[PDB]
Amino acid sequence: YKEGICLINFSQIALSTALVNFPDKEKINLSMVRHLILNSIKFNVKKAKTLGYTKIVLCIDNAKSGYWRRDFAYYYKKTWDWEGYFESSHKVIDELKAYMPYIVMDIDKYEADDHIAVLVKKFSLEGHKILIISSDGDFTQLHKYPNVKQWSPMHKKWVKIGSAEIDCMTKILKGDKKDNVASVKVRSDFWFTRVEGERTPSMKTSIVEAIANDREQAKVLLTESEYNRYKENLVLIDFDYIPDNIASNIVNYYNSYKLPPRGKIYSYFVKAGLSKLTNSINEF
Ligand SMILES: [Mg+2]
């Protein structure tokens, strides 16, 4: 019938785990990253499958050549051994593609949020029960779709939020500094070209919610300048505004993914000196 599908924001989980586990001012090698990633996978796949989500899809961030959203906004997204991590992680990722039984959504200029947002929408409407393994609040945009639950790996609690529309509209109107998305009250590339004497005019909550409940209010409550910014930020924030060609690519990639036979896992575990994991293959 319809298999339970679990979509994992892995790039976040792996890195976040690495930041917490790998001590500062200590170099990070390939094995350290390998152990961490595979253990992270084992722990999360077991949480998913136990709940009924038996198909696992690993979603990876890939900004080797930037982001597709940058085509719309150039400013988009413009001690610890970071080099050592990214270096080893990319190598372990390629290994997961070659031996592990998971579909690894990895497209250059594509975000993990893209793969999740698109695939969640696709398989949700297709009758599958979906599980999003991530703490990211942006994925509350996807809770509106039937049979969609979200599990926070770090806090080990369910993510349940109407309030999703307000959360989404808040970033659309006020912006999202972390991604260089600016408020509609200021110029598009504000965060990238901001001088010092510059601050962003505040956005009253009453308007944020009014537009949240009825987006046609974006025409009556926003000035023409702000409305133009509003439309721009839609493509940057709202998952629904992911271009058809982008989602089309994401889907095609998924459907064209060939999984490696499970016989590969064992020989790989040994090849990587993970002998004390071959007795846990059933957990992968
Ligand atoms: Mg986003």
Torsion-angle region of 77 (φ positive above 0: left; ψ -120 to 50: alpha; else: beta): left
For residue 211, give the amino acid letter: I
Q: Give just the sign of the alpha carbon dihedral 189, 190, 191, 192.
A: positive
Distance 281 CA to ligand 1 centre (A): 34
Selection from 283, 256, 255, 6 nearest residue 151 by Cα: 6
Q: Where are the domains of the chain?
A: 1-162+239-283, 163-238
Distance 178 CA to ligand 1 centre (A): 10
Instruction: Among 1.10.150.20, 2.60.40.420, 3.90.79.10, 1.10.10.60, name the CATH number for the domain at 163-238.
Output: 1.10.150.20
Strands 148-152 and 157-158, by their bridges, are: antiparallel
Distance 54 CA to ligand 1 centre (A): 27
Distance 13 CA to ligand 1 centre (A): 16
Distance 114 CA to ligand 1 centre (A): 8
| Alpha carbons within 13 A on the beta-carbon side of 89 | 23
Instruction: Give the Cα separation of 163 and 137 in Å (integer).
Output: 11
Distance 202 CA to ligand 1 centre (A): 22
Distance 35 CA to ligand 1 centre (A): 29
Q: Is 147 exposed, middle or buried (0-12, 13-18, 19+ CB in 10 A)?
A: middle
Instruction: Give the Cα separation of 231 and 247 in Å (integer).
Output: 19
Q: Which residues contact 248 (CB under 8 A, 6 or more apart)?
A: none
Inter-residue contact 109 to 63 (CB < 8 Å):
yes
Instruction: Give the Cα separation of 92 and 209 in Å (integer).
Output: 44
Distance 102 CA to ligand 1 centre (A): 24
Distance 237 CA to ligand 1 centre (A): 5
Instruction: Among 3.40.50.1010, 3.10.450.50, 3.40.50.11290, 2.40.110.10, name the CATH number for the domain at 1-162+239-283.
Output: 3.40.50.1010
Distance 283 CA to ligand 1 centre (A): 32
Q: Which residues pair with 148 in a beta bridge?
A: 130
Distance 171 CA to ligand 1 centre (A): 10
Distance 104 CA to ligand 1 centre (A): 19
Inter-residue contact 65 to 228 (CB < 8 Å):
no
Inter-residue contact 231 to 66 (CB < 8 Å):
no
Selection from 110, 121, 115, 4 nearest residue 52 by Cα: 4
What are the tokens at 249? 């690519």
Q: Is 175 exposed, middle or buried (0-12, 13-18, 19+ CB in 10 A)?
A: buried
* Integer CA distances (angstroms), 160 to 40, 44, 85, 151, in order: 23, 19, 32, 9
Torsion-angle region of 128 (φ positive above 0: left; ψ -120 to 50: alpha; else: beta): beta
Instruction: Give the Cα separation of 159 and 271 in Å (integer).
Output: 38
- φ and ψ at residue 55, rounded to 5 degrees: -100, 115
Instruction: Give the Cα separation of 251 and 234 in Å (integer).
Output: 22
Distance 154 CA to ligand 1 centre (A): 20
Distance 268 CA to ligand 1 centre (A): 35
Distance 26 CA to ligand 1 centre (A): 32
| Alpha carbons within 13 A on the beta-carbon side of 256 | 8
Distance 138 CA to ligand 1 centre (A): 7
